[model samples]
Target: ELPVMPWATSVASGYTLLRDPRHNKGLAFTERERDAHYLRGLLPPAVVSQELQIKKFMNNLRQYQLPIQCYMAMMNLQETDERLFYKLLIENVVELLPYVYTPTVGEACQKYGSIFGRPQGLYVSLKDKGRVLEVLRNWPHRNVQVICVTDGERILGLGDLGCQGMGIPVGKLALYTALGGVDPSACLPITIDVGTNNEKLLNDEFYIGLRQKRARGEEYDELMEEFMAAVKTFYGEKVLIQFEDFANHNAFDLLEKYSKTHLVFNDDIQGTASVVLAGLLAALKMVGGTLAEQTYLFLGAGEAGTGIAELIALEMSKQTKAPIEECRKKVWLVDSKGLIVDSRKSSLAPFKKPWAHEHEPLTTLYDAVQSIKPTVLIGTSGVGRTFTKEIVEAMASINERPIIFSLSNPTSHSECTAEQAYTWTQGRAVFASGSPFAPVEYDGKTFVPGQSNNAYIFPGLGLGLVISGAVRVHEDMLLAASAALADQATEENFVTGSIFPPFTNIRKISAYIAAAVAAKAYELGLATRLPPPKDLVAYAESCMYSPVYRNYQ
Candidate 1:
């Protein structure tokens, strides 16, 4: 039952107002509001509409040909004026999503501390281990509903950027407000600096973190444990804590450890899984066959690989009422070594254990795809161009409509480009990517490559958690999110060859997802939002964050 006043109310009126991003309206403030709040001549006597401001901003923003320049300009805009920033973004998201969130954000993270001007998020390093609670208290916002944190160990495919990884959490939580409707005052971004293994960063004098090898064992575990306890004590159990861009070793461990007691989510694992799974479910309508019938082949057994692989199995099991063990038989994985076979069970990590099926040893991704003849081929390996012409063509040769998802980031790490997927498949491939790819012209069909952006899932998922006051995340709730996303994919979306809906309708899509997740949480008796809304979707729509300016009294 949250109101549409997404931005925090302002008490400051004049020059102090200009400093607080929440209250700064610039020249957009009405004469009445300005004078009533004791402002006389602070402005130049011009009051422009929010629309005019956005147009002017975009006009200036696009002049910078470099994406990172645009990124920093947008960041400056956010720091200077919160309402205008979200309003600018909500109105023009598709043109700006890549710059703010993904590929461009990757580059921004690499040069974070170097380009760092604003204090965007909290940095809780090992030095703050003993008094983690004090570090949590330093943040300006106390009503935090979502906390997105990273340890700088695994930043995109670019690898370890160390403390510079703060950019990920800040950018992500920004989307929770801009895209998902979560209040900006109620979201926090944090980076846990555990040092870096990357030699380049260690050598750099500009590095803002501890200059040593990465911390491991009891030291790392204890720091995270304190962080968890501090977070719960400060923000309470209902606050959504999102884990972003942690290494595979710690990502799974932290999600497993904290999810039992804290409201935790590993976006790389669960969010990626939910978003990708949502696309595949919708893709099935066109690809033909039940979820149980299609065989899945994954070209990486890391966090992205196993996370997605497990969720797909869970859905298949749910639909067929079959044992999860039996359903998992339909999917196969190929790691760096080869096919994850029973022969390699002893050497595999616990997360990789379930995927080590009864297949014979296969040496390469190409060999595994050919041997398995999978209907769906997913690329999670954060190495670019892995799906070469031959590999893509091989997939084309097997299925009439091959479902291929090159779900990696920065465009550099994707297995193949949309042009490659469509060209190699002769335009018959049902394709999606982790980053946006422009429409591809292949064999005279304008193939709109679906971008399975996690922007579609996490925002609404977090909103549902807020509305439901859910204490713990459930796998079924993830399923509910996936189903909601799948349901939103219109025939217009399908005709355009997109398994996901457009960003223009994303706010609507997030509401649908929130409703479904909230419904599932309530069904499982996990939701604490008592006397649930009669119509979940309507309630969700009512609770959405509005970007329009509020009238000051």
Candidate 2:
């Protein structure tokens, strides 16, 4: 008697109906559905509702004490019932996101060899070599809108996961559907396994990747060239290629090399930058200063650190109508040796050279914080507990509301805990982290720290590119995405000391971000899809993929 849902009509029936993850609703198939789909004897006599199925699954999931156990269960569900998996992921985002990605995903990558239950992604190994296009054709899906590919050399500070880095792409694509509403069928996860330099993985009996050292020089470059070309040839130019978790040198090189040709995006570099910039823009309300006025200091000078720094300077330039070179002076960085100063510019890495400002050498982060007297201190060092008590106090001493962001992955690798930041600053610091943290209750004020997670940016950004049929990614689009996210924050969220909106409204948040990105694409003349929609936001919402089960005819 329930209204027939809008589901795809399929010829599949009987045992095949139960076997198909896309169409199979398991016990949730209505009595009429079972009969109509030729499943009268296939399933039990009693049919259940999807709501009941979710309730049962959630109840069972909670019984597993360990996070990895929960991850395994979720992955199994993903493989079994595609519709149900997205439903669960979209509905219980806040509770299950950590298990899906970040700290838990990082752990999954590390031990992926041991818990390799099912092959969820394609592995383009060194053996595939010249036959790359053939390998891509072997994939069952034909209309992939997005491909998240990783070499696994630098996976979330864990570093050099080799083929196990497949988890990163898989996890990212999962969020693309769950958060951004991109169709799961339109997404692909690929890991290019050249080999591993991580000696431990080389000797591990359970290792699933190539046994030899990583291929470099012409061999690696040729494979990448073939892979990139094959993708464009098979999927066409509209398909977005997202590079994830590659080493700093490779990450930068690949993005630059492909930007002129393919629709490429490096999440670690651009996505991280966009999300952090969004937080900074939102935090401006509480901090009482424009981006142009505030000085920034970063603990790390790697991809994430430099990436975020560049975006901030670019934004500041946009706001003040100043040259980016002038804006760069507002930001400073500290690397392994010391401060990135003028004297060290010659020896600095190409990316770090621009950040090398006119400053005296500062050996420690504490010294950098004290000397620079920055209103904002960012940690992307990938080292845990680096934001010491003294550094927090120094930041607190410098400004009325110190903005401190510990943008590191994995809970263990956080620069400082929310409790420490709030307690040391006497509840005046605007704190956020790459990993999720519990609300810190200090001095009778409950401060809920925000997460500067790339999930907020990439999912919506990718969806926008897909929907707009953008030929190339532009820096301005990243800023547009950041502005859209920052605009989503309400006074209520600011009251709780969270610059970012709650994850519960992520679908709505993603819609606005997608609209913004798509708008930017059309403005830049990069969009191939013509006849722009009058209402881009509503258009974006309409284009989204919902996880509701379709009725079988």
Candidate 3:
């Protein structure tokens, strides 16, 4: 081999050193490897095993009182040394997931600029303009299998954070690896900083993006087109692009446009829909009703609400063999303007059109709730405290036990608090939300609030896609994921008034979803992994990242 090719340099060379995730052995290096690699003086004098390092990091992480603080610490570690960061996460994912990604990540995005210490990912602003591809090419990673991009238009209902929204992609990609077992180095975080409309971000000098107003129309479309094409040209067709945090209007359009051309997915639209639909499917077992029998009314018609509406209709169609149009009639939506109906279709946003139906125009959600007499009332509108006392009472009156989902974010933006939902409904409401809420104790029983979070679905979906080497996403796979998640909810879950299983069992839940996705991929002939592995569940488990240390002789 040496005679035919150029001899590879020592590990100290940039090529080997930069790949420490796969190559670095720390102090376990042999005498020749150590001397040749120039790592002797750079590390501690005495050899400390990877196990010891992992233990030390875990001990320190356990000492943090707040999850965000721990997240920042872990992020800092990742910036300094990525392998160790992943090592810690792989070893203690269940304990650290909420910290590094969801629930805690919502808080991190709110305070991103204030907590900013170092730059880690690419931020393509209006300033980059014509050179966007050049900017992408400059990213250090050569082979990015997954990219999470955000425009800061809708950052967890906290509204626009401008360039500060980069936190989302960073945190999201972290989950791609931690939960999906994608190699961290093969993930990229990107911020398409057209600009922000947020006046607060404009005033803040610390804002990292272009300070101009948000680009719309052709400007936004062209930039997006260039970015999409560049991604394919650079990373190839198999690269997975996750669209995160775009506003309702753009999120829908971009998904529709690129979905055919790119392996694209939107967490708010598809991901949230899948998870919530899963919870609803699970809830059906306890509620003693079929999908066709339930009347669903949503309080918000943004990305989450409309997405959930579409998925529910699809699932219903699958179950009853009814047309999607008939299924849509079972669902209703209310936006800030009022009830979405046939009259509102012409004026409604493109994404809201499908949900609009032939009905008398309604003025308020309260009226829609009473007149529709829906058995399931879901709230996705980001406005906080929108589910008033009267509305909850009306839902309770209409159904023996109304299923209420306040699927908003950041605690402050919840349509109603879990306690309010339970108390107002007199413990007769089955409740969940996008944000975490404490259990409500009423009538001598405790009701735990289920979270309809995308985290539960996307991680496993991504894992399945990666393991199966899926070429494209399919609606059937999403449906399969929902069924898989609902299957995880045992009879015990219903006994406790919880539709979804406990978060502690998320690994098991993810495993089932991965297997389901893999099965779907094979069925669709979209999987590149040939002959499909026997025991899909075992194969999924085998593909997961393990934190255990390897011994060296």
Candidate 4:
């Protein structure tokens, strides 16, 4: 039922046009068009190409010399001229990605109040609980294809930042456009501000959120329900709602609660799971075995770890025609308390109960690793330096090429560094992490650690849902995304110690991922766009938004 509408013929002219970030071209506006739009002396004489504008912006941005300053500058550009911002982000993705996401973004959220600029996204606070629908209606755009919403809890292992968590959805949706080619007009970033649990934030003068403890229990539930229903009523069923960084309990609870009714995807749980699964599948080429044959030992059995373990178990079940329960026996988890075992099942959270198999209690990850003798050692612990030299050595002794994934966000939270993982294993560990790591040189050989970041999956996954008009997100689509990403890894990638292909080709990779996901949508009868395209990949590529400037009539 969705239809694209071109910009109106009576669109804002002159000052208004320049002010609207969506349509602003700044100096890139044409000489003829300026005059046509009543801009005789409103602008400078120089007319610059978009390319030149990008170069100029980057040059000015580089002068800042600080990562957070660069982040602010980039964000300023994002609010100033949306098209140019996307173009610059698209063109210099590899260089600028770290600035806009992950490590830099984490710091940006922490110090957001101190360096706060104009708001980048919608903020829904506790005050707006009753009129949440009215708040939704205030957003200017009529058709938002994707909405990335978050509560300020559990932000990349940095605990809570309250309203400052707005940076996350803003950063995420930016990637939805830059990487997935989704139209910027169709993306919305929202932060649900209940209140702040962070005492430091509450004391800080610049903090932007409500200065109180977080609302919980029935109050929190009511607000979330109101917000979710309002989204469906306003944006229609086809709109994709992505749950960004929430605490483990809420992340799992909300995704499970709304998934069937609303087209919801949790980047922390589902997105992280799919990307990690893709790496594990691709790694099979290097480690040489089927999915079912390998054993997985994950540290930190929270949203990410349990979700990944479930997916791996699901894929294994599909491959070997075994029951999912049986497949789960191959995956083991260690949390803050210790290894998850049948003895711990009574006390485990509902999500963790599935992995609580029949094993004697193990007191440490080191013990779990020794007892389990896992082929794959995963770290979603969000605790840095947890993967000790002893643990890595044990893993090295257990397997010829130990498959290790330190999939925790921000550089500080990584369980192990690429250097440590490689050097400790004597260059034999197949390593990947959530945050980017520099190439490591061990014994004269360079190892490029793969990053199993959710950015690689969520953008394309959301794009497929939008293009296919999929009303429901099926688990098969996640499996499809994993398979598509795994296929993109080639001989060249494996030789250099990277399980994932380079980000230089992520747009193409996103297109392929979209094709697979959309194809699966049709296969499952969840897609509503009707009469599926003959060539889904070509269709996906054609549907993508380009950052090039549009001509005014």
Q: Write the per-residue lDDT of candidate 2 for residues 224-255, one digit (tens) a residue.
A: 99999989888898999999999988888999
TM-score, candidate number 1: 0.95
Models 1 onward score TM values of: 0.95, 0.96, 0.87, 0.95
lDDT of 4 by residue, 39-132 (tens): 7689889999899999999999889878999999999999889889999998898899889997799899999999999777788889998888
Between candidates 1 and 3, the TM-score winner: 1
Candidate with better TM-score, 2 vs 3: 2
- Compared with the true structure, model 3 gives a TM-score of 0.87
**Clashing residue pairs, backbone N/CA/C < 3 A, model 1:** 145-186
- How does candidate 4 score on lDDT? 0.91
Candidate 1: stretches off by over 4 Å? 1-10
Candidate 4 at residue 233, lDDT?
A: 80
Candidate 2 accuracy as lDDT: 0.91
- For model 4, the superposed segments whose C-alpha errors exceed 4 Å read 1-9
How many Å off is the CA of 436 in candidate 4? 1.3
lDDT of 1 by residue, 364-405 (tens): 889988899999999998789999998899999999999999
Please identify which of the two predictions, 3 or 4, would achieve the higher TM-score against the true structure. 4
lDDT per residue (tens digit) for residues 42-63 in model 3: 6556766667777887888889
Ranking by TM-score: 2, 4, 1, 3
Error of 1 at 315 (Å): 0.4
Could you tell me the TM-score of candidate 2?
A: 0.96
